[PDB]
């Protein structure tokens, strides 16, 4: 299995050189719609974009655009949306796409403040007293629960589209302690996460694509992501062995840019995937 690659890699000290190459074979599609002068305030990073062909739309004939790509996994039979953090501005749109799209989860892997920055609008309401409706797309969120834990947090939301008077439970996994543009160091930490995750049903076909985001939207949430597709087609096959990470990150690297932000997500990708083997191959 891959745990030879890693090992070699690592006793080669040639991450960077391995995550360098990964950029330099990674997909280089147009991004017009996002560069659009209207669309400027719409994006958190000048240089994190969503390229045309994979960004969702909103069904708005006003402006459809959100900073937001559509991670289609065809092999593996699982999506994705990756998007970055809602900017004030961009709440209602992000609720808005949750909608449309049909999302049951919603994953945060970072925090509204990191390194004395906001990184993120606290898109979600944290008093169930207090609930948050967006005007602008006109629907309604409220806070129904929260079960906080050591290092992560899973909230459960009522959205309402105020139009329709129709309502949806959503599931918010918040993971808390994960250092912006770093590893959260332990697979076990994460795996937890991401099983918690997946028992949930948030991650299953019968529902719209999971959201998943962090303050771009490409570095813990490439993570995140690539990690549980490797897993996803090893269960399928059932065989660790046929499955190549490289090969995986550069497929989703074709419908969002720059997934997997440093050299050590990836060594870190590669640890969490092969230990969640273990699990995945019987050892539950």
């Given at each position: 299995?891959?745990?030879?690659?890693?090992?070699?890699?690592?006793?080669?000290?040639?991450?960077?050189?391995?995550?360098?190459?990964?950029?330099?074979?990674?997909?280089?599609?147009?991004?017009?719609?996002?560069?659009?002068?209207?669309?400027?305030?719409?994006?958190?990073?000048?240089?994190?974009?969503?390229?045309?062909?994979?960004?969702?739309?909103?069904?708005?004939?006003?402006?459809?655009?959100?900073?937001?790509?559509?991670?289609?996994?065809?092999?593996?039979?699982?999506?994705?949306?990756?998007?970055?953090?809602?900017?004030?501005?961009?709440?209602?749109?992000?609720?808005?796409?949750?909608?449309?799209?049909?999302?049951?989860?919603?994953?945060?892997?970072?925090?509204?403040?990191?390194?004395?920055?906001?990184?993120?609008?606290?898109?979600?309401?944290?008093?169930?007293?207090?609930?948050?409706?967006?005007?602008?797309?006109?629907?309604?969120?409220?806070?129904?629960?929260?079960?906080?834990?050591?290092?992560?947090?899973?909230?459960?939301?009522?959205?309402?589209?105020?139009?329709?008077?129709e309502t949806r439970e959503i599931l918010?996994?918040?993971?808390?302690?994960?250092?912006?543009?770093?590893?959260?160091?332990?697979?076990?930490?994460?795996?937890?996460?991401?099983?918690?995750?997946?028992?949930?049903?948030?991650?299953?076909?019968?529902?719209?694509?999971?959201?998943?985001?962090?303050?771009?939207?490409?570095?813990?949430?490439?993570?995140?992501?690539?990690?549980?597709?490797?897993?996803?087609?090893?269960?399928?096959?059932?065989?660790?062995?046929?499955?190549?990470?490289?090969?995986?990150?550069?497929?989703?690297?074709?419908?969002?840019?720059?997934?997997?932000?440093?050299?050590?997500?990836?060594?870190?990708?590669?640890?969490?995937?092969?230990?969640?083997?273990?699990?995945?191959?019987?050892?539950?």
């Amino acid at each position: 299995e891959m745990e030879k690659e890693f090992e070699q890699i690592d006793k080669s000290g040639s991450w960077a050189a391995i995550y360098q190459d990964i950029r330099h074979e990674a997909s280089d599609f147009p991004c017009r719609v996002a560069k659009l002068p209207k669309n400027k305030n719409r994006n958190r990073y000048r240089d994190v974009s969503p390229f045309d062909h994979s960004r969702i739309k909103l069904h708005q004939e006003d402006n459809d655009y959100i900073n937001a790509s559509l991670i289609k996994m065809e092999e593996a039979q699982r999506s994705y949306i990756l998007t970055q953090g809602p900017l004030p501005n961009t709440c209602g749109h992000f609720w808005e796409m949750v909608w449309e799209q049909k999302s049951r989860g919603v994953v945060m892997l970072n925090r509204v403040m990191e390194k004395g920055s906001l990184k993120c609008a606290q898109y979600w309401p944290q008093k169930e007293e207090k609930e948050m409706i967006f005007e602008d797309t006109n629907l309604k969120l409220t806070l129904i629960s929260e079960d906080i834990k050591s290092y992560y947090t899973v909230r459960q939301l009522e959205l309402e589209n105020l139009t329709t008077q129709e309502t949806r439970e959503i599931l918010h996994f918040h993971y808390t302690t994960w250092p912006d543009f770093g590893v959260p160091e332990s697979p076990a930490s994460f795996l937890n996460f991401l099983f918690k995750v997946r028992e949930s049903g948030s991650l299953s076909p019968e529902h719209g694509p999971v959201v998943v985001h962090c303050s771009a939207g490409i570095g813990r949430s490439g993570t995140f992501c690539l990690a549980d597709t490797c897993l996803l087609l090893m269960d399928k096959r059932k065989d660790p062995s046929s499955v190549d990470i490289k090969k995986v990150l550069l497929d989703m690297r074709k419908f969002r840019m720059g997934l997997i932000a440093t050299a050590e997500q990836l060594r870190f990708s590669y640890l969490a995937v092969i230990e969640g083997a273990k699990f995945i191959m019987g050892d539950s």
